[PDB]
Amino acid sequence: KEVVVSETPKRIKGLEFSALSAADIVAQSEVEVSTRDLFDLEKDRAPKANGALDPKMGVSSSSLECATCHGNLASCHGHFGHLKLALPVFHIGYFKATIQILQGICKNCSAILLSETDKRQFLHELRRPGVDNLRRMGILKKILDQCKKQRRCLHCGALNGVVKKAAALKIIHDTFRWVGKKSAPEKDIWVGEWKEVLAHNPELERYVKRCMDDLNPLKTLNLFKQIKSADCELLGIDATVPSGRPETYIWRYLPAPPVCIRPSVMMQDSPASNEDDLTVKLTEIVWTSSLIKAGLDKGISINNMMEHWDYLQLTVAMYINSDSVNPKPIRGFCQRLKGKQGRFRGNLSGKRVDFSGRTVISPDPNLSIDEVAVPDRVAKVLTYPEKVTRYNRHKLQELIVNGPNVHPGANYLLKRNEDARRNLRYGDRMKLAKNLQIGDVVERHLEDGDVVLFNRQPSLHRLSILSHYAKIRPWRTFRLNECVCTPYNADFDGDEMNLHVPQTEEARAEAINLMG
Amino acid sequence: EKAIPKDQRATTPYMTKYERARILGTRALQISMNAPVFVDLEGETDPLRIAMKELAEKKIPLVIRRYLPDGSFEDWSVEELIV
Amino acid sequence: TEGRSRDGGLRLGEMERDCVIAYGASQLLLERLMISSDAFEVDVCDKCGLMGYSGWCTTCKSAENIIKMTIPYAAKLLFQELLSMNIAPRLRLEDIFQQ
Amino acid sequence: FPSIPLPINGPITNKERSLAVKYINFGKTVKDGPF
Amino acid sequence: YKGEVLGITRFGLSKMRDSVLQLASFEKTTDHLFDAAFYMKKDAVEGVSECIILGQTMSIGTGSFKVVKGTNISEKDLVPKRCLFES
Amino acid sequence: FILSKIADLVRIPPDQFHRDTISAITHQLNNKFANKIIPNVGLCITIYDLLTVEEGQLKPGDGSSYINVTFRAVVFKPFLGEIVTGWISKCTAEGIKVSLLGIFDDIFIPQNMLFEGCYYTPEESAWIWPKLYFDVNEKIRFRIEREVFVDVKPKSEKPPAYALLGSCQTDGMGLVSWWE
Amino acid sequence: MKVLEERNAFLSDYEVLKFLTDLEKKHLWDQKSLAPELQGITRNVVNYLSINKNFMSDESFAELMTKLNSFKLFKAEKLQIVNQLPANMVHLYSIVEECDARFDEKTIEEMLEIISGYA
Amino acid sequence: PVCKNCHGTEFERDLSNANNDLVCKACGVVSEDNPIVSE
Amino acid sequence: SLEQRTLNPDLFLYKELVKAHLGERAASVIGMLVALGRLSVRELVEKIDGMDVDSVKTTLVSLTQLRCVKYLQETAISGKKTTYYYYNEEGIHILLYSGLIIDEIITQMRVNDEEEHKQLVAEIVQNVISLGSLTVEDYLSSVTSDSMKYTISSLFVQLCEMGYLIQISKLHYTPIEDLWQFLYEKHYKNIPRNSPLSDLKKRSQAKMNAKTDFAKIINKPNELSQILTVDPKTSLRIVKPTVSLTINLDRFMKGRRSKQLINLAKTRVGSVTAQVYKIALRLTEQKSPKIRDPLTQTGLLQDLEEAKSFQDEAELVEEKTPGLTFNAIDLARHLPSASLINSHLKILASSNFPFLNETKPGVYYVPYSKLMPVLKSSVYEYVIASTLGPSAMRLSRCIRDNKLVSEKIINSTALMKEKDIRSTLASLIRYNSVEIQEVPRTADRSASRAVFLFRCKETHSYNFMRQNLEWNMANLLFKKEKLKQENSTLLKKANRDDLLPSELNQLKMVNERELNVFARLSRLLSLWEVFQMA
């Protein structure tokens, strides 16, 4: 029940981007992957204990059941998992964008290297309503160069130099800028740190002359965590979202994607599956992070876990983007979104279509321009949907008794009470031919008079793809009238064309009135 | 920002090429959804063919809303335009 | 699936996609690229806009502000693959009607 | 699930018991005052 | 039309029109991704290569206007049926 | 018996083009709103009239015509003290299942406002009386004090939609044949 | 679906049966065909509200309490006493409050005369 | 394994026109469409 | 509880305080300024959602009265009067400390005993700032008009002239930097054609004269020559009745400073001298160097020569202060014995902390600038040994004197086994007490062919410990108000009476559990206020 529902059709007004927080990661995640082993040695066919292709994270087979949402393979939309790290690492994508908001900050008191009224001038160039992405990234370049010309901070007065990479994949803060004023209140303590370690281990006059303060990914977030929200707008981010903190731009938790995007390809070369590149990279991520969690609990060498945490730094910087290998090179996320027809060109820009064909052509003068000839052995395969009306009820009754063996017939049928479809080969046809409730749809074969797209595969210009009428002829190739061969520049020497058919009642009218 | 009556009616009075590719697109599927026709059909199938026939006598019960780029309406019935 | 021995299904490439809009037709363009090819129906939540499974949001478990639409599946998995690293494609919604 | 507590966790003494009464009537004065 | 001559390069498209979906389809893909969420950007979808990805109606061509049904009725029979409110 | 000016957006399939404008949108709003509850308003029954109608639009995909329209319907909201002589067909041992026969029977109203000698007896009676007894299929008089409109859906009987608060506090309450 | 006003007006119980009778009229011969969900629910509402009257012209019901407007502002209860136990003043005591000490005139028997005029 | 209308226990796959749909024998209703192979 | 544990700075504290004891409507706006810095009214309403323009002006005047913001005006050449609004930090510390001033009136005003204004003198602190501002006529026209209020009005000049009752002005309702800009070009009202040469001296003559003006205008609050009016009739003295005055933190934070500084005595000596040294400090906080020291907030602090001068004057004022340099003579009669003075303060000279060491022979003073930085070192290392093993306390002391320590010399200096130190040491990289510094033996800073050094880093070790507790304030305050969300029906029923016999059971457990909240809040707050000597 006795309850009403009222929903409207809705549109997307435009995307907006964000980096989700370190609390948003466990929000949509529902399983946790603490263990390492993919296959349990119980030796069931899908042996997955905790940290693997989990049957309530998702499903990577047509024989299993997604325990979370429901369904075998088509009903699962995928569900996220999450990891937990012992100590943070960098984000390799934000690795460039984490030093730009680091040059502007103080290295001792965590403040922006500007005066009071000067930064009050800069955001006035933000608060006017006319700001595009050109000038906003333009003036962020200009305010960053102002902060690099300011040696000593305003709160505690500690001098700062420059910070840059150390070329592994870590950054170094080139601190002390002496010209002729070596009388710094820090150098004497720096000499005091120098002097005490000259007696013990004397082999240090050479290597301590260069060694300098690093910023490991454990110090950096605890350098970011105490900065104020009153000046995050001076460095690109805005507040008022929970994810507006700069703390969330390095990895502390990482999510696990669903298994639908990384499916277990069963190549059938063995009774075992060739497991893909993502899972066999994610497996040692939790393995290395487990021995650092357990090793520091037990007590291991800090000279040992330093490279392990650097091994964990480099490994997550390859799971995402495998360009940083510096050596068969493993695939990744960024390793497929770019490139020729990896993504965005063969999956989003140019997809693959249904209801097509690709045969050779042969000329025919004796039919008119706007009519192409279609052979019948492809014409009783490529179908076109057709809603029943009181106008066309008489013809479709005679059409449905033909069946899918003679040319002017149908292949499939869908009653409006029926849910999926019904096939015409199996079951009695004449007993089904009598009812045909007028509100349903059937799929006749292609016939003379319908609307067909047709083009050459190397396309020169917009006049290489046109529409035509069809005509059914009993041979085994595509016959067109000869005078239209000059747009297609065909040569009848073994070149093959492809035809398309629209499958609405609206776009069928679209193709004639513009592309006829 | 609202509908402009016949006083400031300042666009072409002509059914452009992109119009009759859309009305005939959106008339014909109503015929496939059991709408009543207005013109004297023959023994006749293919609801696109009956759609372009009905356009000859301008018996389409529709009206086109042309938007100006400033967010303004403009109305045109399908019989008001010529071709 | 690409390949005649793997039953075919031809690639309407990027160069043909430029030649459609030069006609200015905008209705078979969606029909040949998501209707007959890649139609997939996704429930998305209105506030904190991103998708959830059969009837949920799983980041504010309310099951209330959910709108049914249909998107390309090749765009849906992008909203998982780009969501795998720390970039959140927040969607924002309007209705079509009442201009 | 979080271990390692702060070491200030004990029964209230009368030295601060009356001091804590001065808080509960403080916020009741403000909320039942003007605002 | 924006004050200067500029090419059709990666540097050339970075100043024509900054819409991260249209720039994702060019040569450099992911370098326009990370800085987009870093700056908390907000772009409306009306580009041709954008509605293709989102699977929505293109705003140009035969998708400029919208189709309106005539409701062929006036207020001569739109009166209420109100009577005997309270007496 | 009160009016509620609301707005709504509605479609009609194109096979109702032969039926006129007003009667077609009336039918499509009937089976959308008949015997339906509204969140935090009440239960609308039948569309009273049509206040104003707006020009119809069309989705490019569907092909039907879409119309937003404003109207008020009939919805019964008696009073916060209104006498109602309903009937009953059910009795339970913690309150009384006073439920209106014919229209809606989702009403359980307790007894918390009477004398102190009220309990349950398993002998066809409500309790023992210190006085003609009452049974089903007769006019039993009761009034209304509050209601609770909750519409939660915790996906994972007591329909929580339309629940009312009742009383039998004064004399003559329990049967209308005790008076007149 | 937007709510503009909740309590826009007040309609008498006469039009609850009067407009329904027109809706019973254009409903293909209801109640007599022994030899939609609106077909089912309107059965149960046409034989519920008029029963207390049963077991008429609108001009009588429009002029019941027009002469009995002996109030100051508290007059919203004029609509509700139209079928609430006719010809009884011991039931009107529990309907309206503070009238045991305000109405001690012939009005409390004139309320008995208006309520007994139609029953 | 069980059809929705006739509850058929045997399923036949049509390879004639390479639709590769799976149909019950008795009444002819399709059980699955658009097969999902493992490449 | 992970949604609060991660993505919340001390903004989680400040939004909670206005949610704690105030209306809900101002919680969004006071977060909006500090999340943005500065915004005026004409851009305030667009950022927020749910409040109109004059609805803000209805709401903004509420927290303006309780001194929660500090306003400012700026005009443009072409533009009108624009009211840029800033944020107040110390005005909400009154709301934070609000119970501890009540037990500061009692413990500092000790002349009285068995007085019948005990309930009244606690009410005036609840009156002077909870109503916002306060003037003399506000309490004189109460339900008692005369009613022996001459014993009450003349009692207030005892409570005013002891301090922390400074009349407010534009100085308190504005922050400290935006007034420095107006007086800076007030000392730059000099035409450039008087003596133009050696142009680097031109801001020098601007800054040395504005420095004397800033020292003058900070005394304008403390200028007690005009906060008092001599009465020729019926009264000895009274403050001026047309004075609108509030209470501040300056005597309280210095009062809590010595209240904290007395706690090291009971550790470093027994109970005898801990009673002695209480008297030695109570005469000094009436005029001491300021604990926040507002002269170093924002200015020319970035260059070293001026950064030297911010303490080249402060110690000379501290050493030559007449207001605290006591003769070590008159304190013996304050105990309720001249040999016992120079004997019980002989161990004050010999103790390992720099208090009561440098002075003229015979006369003493309490050194300040070199004292509280070791108090910050005293309690912080003691909290390191609190929540984990005292083996970390051995490690914590080991680094400051063995500078830039390695793991080879750590076994010559400290003496434990190599199974329990690395478990303890790694428990202190996580908590930011030590700083790693790697030195390579090969090219490109290779990890394996490298060794490592440590460092104390006395800055980031204390910044972490400050905000680790600042979140721990409102984490308990968030559990306060969710206890008010529960049981919300009967609490308004218990507030409409001014009685079910089983309902009263569920009213006591919710009252004693919230009683432990304010008890433990005072504990961690004393641990937090040690780090405010910055």
Ligand SMILES: [Zn+2]
């Ligand atoms: Zn959402």
